[PDB]
């Protein structure tokens, strides 16, 4: 319990390069004397909060940037202090991305967006712009031996289709997430969603294909193409295959919209040790000399870091993983992006599976979102009362911003919050929204 007390503890993904990270690691011990344990736990981005909550996690945790917000809302993350100096070595709009109430809340490392990897040799020339090829990747399917196999069973690979003709999140109007204006029950995700199960029932597809399914087909010459980030590519080198990377095919004309994660580095709260993984993110990751060797054990995408992403972007695979990163959508950091993920996991497990219709399967997760927005809008009106009651203003007054971000009515809300408020705490609220 409470890990440790003058070392370093990282977690991050699987998927990742964590042997790499694990280098830079052993160099900041060389150099310091500093212990740096690098682990790969399994869902670690919902044990992350659980035992983050306790005290307890590591110093440093490995997530794209998407489930941040919810960190830093649950108050699991240490704000970040980069100097000027070096927020100018990287890109602004990764470091937009780490921001959360106008406050930096993790290092950003790399720019990750799926891309269609395809087989040369059964396949020159990939199906473009899908538009007259979906009836063509139905029928280029039709030359059997599998033209397409990627994984189903999280909808981070199945969103850019279910994104290409209108579905959406949350809306904008212009900036500020109108949550409550969902659109994964619209006409564009319904349609995007029932081509996917067409391809399934139609048997291009098997709707219990996974990750290392569609891993292991591609780099076996089983199938002709698949869906994945650029962590994939060094597997695909191990496994000799002619491969190349390139733009994902449109639907009804339009481009796939993939969701962009930002992979990012936040600091526990809870951690005895932070000037100590500032030191570690700051000056020894974030380095050309710290990516490249997380990038040679599997590549990180674009990286955050300007002068080590000028020498990545001379390679095509990179160019073709900006081209989608730019055709789609840089993924929201707020807290409800988690009710999103797992009622949108739920639609398309149960729409592929037969288990209910696409169109049962989206107003079911458009009503799961919903719901978890008003849960939350509660939990914060209450949260907000008891923690003015207790005299801590600041904290109070933040939870009643936070309901009012997910409210019906806010206009209406204001007024009522100016009648139960003392004049200071309301002025306090005004400068919390
Ligand atoms: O499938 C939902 C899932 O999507 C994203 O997770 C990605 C992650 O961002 C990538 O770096 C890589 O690890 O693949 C994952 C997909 O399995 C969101 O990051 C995540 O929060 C969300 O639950």
């Known amino acids: 319990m409470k890990i440790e007390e003058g070392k370093l503890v990282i977690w991050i993904n699987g998927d990742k390069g964590y042997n790499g990270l694990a280098e830079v690691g052993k160099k ?23 035992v983050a909550a306790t ?3 590591p110093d440093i945790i490995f997530w794209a940037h998407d489930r941040f917000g919810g960190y830093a809302q649950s108050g699991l993350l240490a704000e970040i202090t980069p100097d000027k100096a070096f927020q100018d070595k990287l890109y602004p709009f990764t470091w937009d991305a780490v921001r959360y109430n106008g406050k930096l809340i993790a290092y950003p490392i790399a720019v990750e967006a799926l891309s269609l990897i395809y087989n040369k040799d059964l396949l020159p020339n990939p199906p473009k712009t899908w538009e007259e090829i979906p009836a063509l990747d139905k029928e280029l399917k039709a030359k059997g031996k599998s033209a397409l196999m990627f994984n189903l069973q999280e909808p981070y690979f199945t969103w850019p289709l279910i994104a290409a003709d209108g579905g959406y999140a949350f809306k904008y109007e212009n900036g500020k997430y109108d949550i409550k204006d969902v659109g994964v029950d619209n006409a564009g995700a319904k349609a995007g969603l029932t081509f996917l199960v067409d391809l399934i029932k139609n048997k291009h597809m098997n709707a219990d294909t996974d990750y290392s399914i569609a891993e292991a087909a591609f780099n076996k010459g089983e199938t002709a193409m698949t869906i994945n980030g650029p962590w994939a590519w060094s597997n695909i080198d191990t496994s000799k295959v002619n491969y190349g990377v390139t733009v994902l095919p449109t639907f009804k004309g339009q481009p796939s919209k993939p969701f962009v994660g930002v992979l990012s580095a936040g600091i526990n709260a809870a951690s005895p040790n932070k000037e100590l993984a500032k030191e570690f993110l700051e000056n020894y990751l974030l380095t050309d000399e710290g990516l490249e060797a997380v990038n040679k054990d599997k590549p990180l995408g674009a990286v955050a870091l300007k002068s080590y992403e000028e020498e990545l972007v001379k390679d095509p695979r990179i160019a073709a993983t900006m081209e989608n990163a730019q055709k789609g959508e840089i993924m929201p950091n707020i807290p409800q992006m988690s009710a999103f993920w797992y009622a949108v996991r739920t639609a398309v497990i149960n729409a592929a599976s037969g288990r209910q219709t696409v169109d049962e399967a989206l107003k079911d997760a458009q009503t799961r979102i919903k719901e978890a927005v008003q849960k939350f809008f509660l939990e914060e009106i209450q949260l907000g009362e008891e923690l003015l009651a207790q005299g801590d203003y600041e904290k109070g007054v933040d939870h009643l911003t936070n309901a009012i971000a997910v409210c019906g009515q806010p206009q209406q809300l204001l007024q009522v919050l100016q009648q139960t408020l003392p004049p200071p705490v309301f002025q306090m609220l005004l400068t919390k929204l």
């Open 28 to 50: 900041f011990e060389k150099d310091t004397g500093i212990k740096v344990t690098v682990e790969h736990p399994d869902k670690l981005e919902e044990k992350f909060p659980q």
């Open 55 to 57: 005290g307890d996690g």
